[PDB]
Amino acid sequence: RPPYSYMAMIQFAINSTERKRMTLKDIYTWIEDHFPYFKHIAKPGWKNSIRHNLSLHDMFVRETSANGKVSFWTIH
Amino acid sequence: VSERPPYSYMAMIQFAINSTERKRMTLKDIYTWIEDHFPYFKHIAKPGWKNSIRHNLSLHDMFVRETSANGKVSFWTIH
DNA sequence: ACCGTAAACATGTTTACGGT
DNA sequence: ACCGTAAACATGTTTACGGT
């Protein structure tokens, strides 16, 4: 287990992007890649904890692309 | 009167979306607009019609979505 | 091809509880 | 006080089928 909260590990991913925005599936991939704990050990429930933290903490606001066909997560 | 209205789902959605000042509407306000302007969906239809409306929104490409600045409200808009 | 219906899966919103 | 974890509900994305 990594010594970071979900809110912490999520913002790490979003801050790692060029356009200060990240898709949910790209948040999973970033956490799986940068913390091998979630790729090999954690039960599939950790993706539920990720969605739970995003909607709850107000720092995570979403925004839609110009094409209006992709919904991103960004920090305020 | 509440007999079925002669409009497709895509049609009744555009009526709702275009009836706003900013050509935009939240999903719950689309249900409410169709329920209020066509009592068929308020008194008769089984809960599946809300599944078909969402189905129409995602499938037809003319229905694109837009988010508020507060990032806490998701709208449906036409381009 | 088009519309309507159903259902599975992905994603976003909430309440709820035990433990760090 | 609040995280971590679970589950129910709302919303968005898809494939699949029968009928006109």
Curated annotation (Swiss-Prot), chain B:
TM spans (from-to): none
Q: What superkingdom heads the lineage?
A: Eukaryota
Location of the protein in the cell? Nucleus
Expression induction: Induced during liver regeneration and oxidative stress.
Q: Which tissues is this chain's protein expressed in?
A: Expressed in thymus, testis, small intestine, colon followed by ovary. Appears to be expressed only in adult organs containing proliferating/cycling cells or in response to growth factors. Also expressed in epithelial cell lines derived from tumors. Not expressed in resting cells. Isoform 2 is highly expressed in testis.
Q: Which residues bind DNA?
A: 3-79
Question: For this protein, what post-translational modification is recorded in UniProt?
Answer: Phosphorylated in M (mitotic) phase. Phosphorylation by the checkpoint kinase CHEK2 in response to DNA damage increases the FOXM1 protein stability probably stimulating the transcription of genes involved in DNA repair. Phosphorylated by CDK1 in late S and G2 phases, creating docking sites for the POLO box domains of PLK1. Subsequently, PLK1 binds and phosphorylates FOXM1, leading to activation of transcriptional activity and subsequent enhanced expression of key mitotic regulators. Phosphorylated by GSK3B leading to ubiquitination and proteasomal degradation. Ubiquitinated in a FBXW7-dependent manner leading to proteasomal degradation.
Q: What is known of its domains?
A: Within the protein there is a domain which acts as a transcriptional activator. Insertion of a splicing sequence within it inactivates this transcriptional activity, as it is the case for isoform 4.
Q: How does it assemble?
A: Interacts with PINT87aa which is encoded by the circular form of the long non-coding RNA LINC-PINT; the interaction inhibits FOXM1-mediated transcription of PHB2.
Task of the protein: Transcription factor regulating the expression of cell cycle genes essential for DNA replication and mitosis. Plays a role in the control of cell proliferation. Also plays a role in DNA break repair, participating in the DNA damage checkpoint response. Promotes transcription of PHB2.
Q: What is this protein called?
A: Forkhead box protein M1
| Native source species | Homo sapiens
Please give the range of the full-length protein represented by this chain. 233 to 311 of 763
